[PDB]
Write a protein that binds this ligand. Sequence first.
Ligand SMILES: COc1ccc2c(c1)N(CCCNC(=O)c1cccc3c1N[C@H](C)CC(=O)N3)CCC2
Length: 126
Amino acid sequence: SMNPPPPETSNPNKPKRQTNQLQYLLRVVLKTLWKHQFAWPFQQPVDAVKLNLPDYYKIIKTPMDMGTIKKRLENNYYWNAQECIQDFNTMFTNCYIYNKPGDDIVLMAEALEKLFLQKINELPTE
Ligand SMILES: COc1ccc2c(c1)N(CCCNC(=O)c1cccc3c1N[C@H](C)CC(=O)N3)CCC2
């Protein structure tokens, strides 16, 4: 099977804005996670072809990744911070559904999630 197209990062029919929390998600939260040693697997859509995961898009119908989230923030794709946080949460939940708990990838996601949740606790007032 071919990869699916990636998630949309722009939509000319979706209203756009910047908020204080969206700027914090891009400038602080995403920056902290992106520089982590464990970030690489999560910096772009899951390439199920290159990574030999032929059932990945059979099991995961709501793919999400940090590269898409970055692009969405830079493109002012989100209206609400919660949309952005939901994408991060989807990304971690996919990892927990698809892989065995002991898998290296899951240990890596658990660490990144922990750092995510700490940084979201520091979100400024809307
Ligand atoms: C990122 O691009 C590349 C390109 C080339 C190479 C690598 C990575 N790597 C690093 C490989 C990173 N492995 C994965 O991602 C991965 C592998 C198996 C299963 C999952 C995996 N993780 C995703 C989140 C999907 C997921 O749930 N489970 C090395 C070989 C060369």
